[PDB]
Amino acid sequence: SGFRKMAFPSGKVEGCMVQVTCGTTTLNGLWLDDVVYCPRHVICTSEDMLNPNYEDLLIRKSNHNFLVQAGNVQLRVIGHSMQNCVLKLKVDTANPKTPKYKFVRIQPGQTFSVLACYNGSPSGVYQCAMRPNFTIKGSFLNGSAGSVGFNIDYDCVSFCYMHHMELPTGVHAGTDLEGNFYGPFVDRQTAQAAGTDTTITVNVLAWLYAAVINGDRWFLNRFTTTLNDFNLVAMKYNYEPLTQDHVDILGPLSAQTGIAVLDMCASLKELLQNGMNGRTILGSALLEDEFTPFDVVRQCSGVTF
Amino acid sequence: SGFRKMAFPSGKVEGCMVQVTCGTTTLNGLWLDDVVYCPRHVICTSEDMLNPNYEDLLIRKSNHNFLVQAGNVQLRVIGHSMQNCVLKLKVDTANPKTPKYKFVRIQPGQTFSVLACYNGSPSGVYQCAMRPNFTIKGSFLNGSAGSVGFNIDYDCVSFCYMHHMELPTGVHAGTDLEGNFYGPFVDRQTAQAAGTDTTITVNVLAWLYAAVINGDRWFLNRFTTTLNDFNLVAMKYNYEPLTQDHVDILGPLSAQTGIAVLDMCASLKELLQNGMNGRTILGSALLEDEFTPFDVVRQCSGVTFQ
Amino acid sequence: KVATVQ
């Protein structure tokens, strides 16, 4: 019993974290096989950030200008190219600790674990969610660029995020491992703004199922509802439109608990209107939405890696 | 910027997790050097748990009765013995992935990272605080016993908690790594229950400073108070009492923010007596109490002007 | 306020 914001075991990723230095600027890199992935603004300085011409700035760089340190062992850079907003440093040694790994681009609403690194040394791990506006409510200080986000399946690490920037509102923006930003942001120190952020409805529903699974049940009712009678209230409280796809993805949890999706939906409707009125759910007076349906099954069934 | 519950990277611990099976019971063990540590009730049957006599049950077991597995590779057990509620199984191989480590016994209010495991393989990692009633509000299922809690300072792991059992309210109990339980609990099937739980005052205060550093400052009032005064008030609200060591540990946050420890204590008063009025703090409608001051200082790196 | 590359 119990339900916590659980992050993936980070052991496989820690062995891939290296440091990447370029003049005065240090950040983090990801060492997989004989390539080190890192954000391209490592070639920038603290005065080349308003509107940096990355093409030109890279031209003036050679292999030797990239200091790549795995621990205190320097890695020889034998190549370098730029793919979107990320930099690929070809090194002469394949990482012995390379895990089984893929690159994926997640969708808004999906979650992943962030391994926050500084100077190439992992310092903390936490679970985050790709918010609908394509930002993340992370915890990042200067030097955290190159920190990666990831999921695990069996023994295959799926890297889905590399950290680049902090937006003016304190939220964070980054890329997939191909260098394509999530959302419309760019790696320049300009005034960019995140769109309006909704709540991830399908994730809150999964969270309630995890509540029921754990014995929190003051919120269930006998009333049920339709999908469209529900979305009318959803679109009223800045909630994502629930689709049949979402109802389907919640199938395995409805079956496990016995509560139909639409009944738990109605329970959410009154929680949205009347509220919690003092009582908590899984230790929270707010409706958590950073748990996917698979996030609940993994935690509640003890899936291991 | 941004503030998040953060666990320590679990890699150093993952390399120490193993699986220990005795008869029909399997749980997790910690493989340090040539010793595997695990909760002693692995040697118990369901019937034994009503009133277990661990000395007797252990003497009846041979080294061969303990199957210890690092993944699928079996570790030959060459000696076994008991230290309070923990079993120590000597094996023929030292763990090549043993990190620099220490066993520490932590105090209520202090936080640590739990690597929840099943069959010696990890499921996830999260951040916990020893509650004042000597329980933890974790996420544990059958087979999770033997999972450990830890902190990482430098490259040294400070093992503080090994998991044992779940109390009837859904909270969890366990021992330090020398086998001594946290709290009044024992590892037998008896009517056991955790005491009334108090709120970790020093952690809520650190959380309030954190809220200030991140922009959220509505709750800041223009009053101050004394320590003995605030303590009497926190007592009516089942808040822990604040010691002078607590005010010293909050010093760095006080100087960083310019807000005195006793001024925040007065803000905390207004919140306890009048509530939040539908207002959030760091995206929470409750006073979080599982962030230590040290946790805040690590995620908020502000300047102290002098 | 402007974005900060970290």
Author numbering:
A (entry chain A): 1 to 305
B (entry chain B): 1 to 306
C (entry chain C): -6 to -1
Paper quotes:
The SARS-CoV-2 translates its genome into polyproteins that must be cleaved to release individual proteins essential for replication of the virus. Given that Mpro processes the majority of these sites, any intervention that stops this process, such as an inhibitor, would block viral growth. The crystal structures of inactive SARS-CoV-2 Mpro, with the catalytic Cys145 mutated to Ala, with 9 substrate and 6 product complexes were determined to sub-2.5 Å resolution. As in previous apo and inhibitor-bound crystal structures, Mpro crystallized as a homodimer.
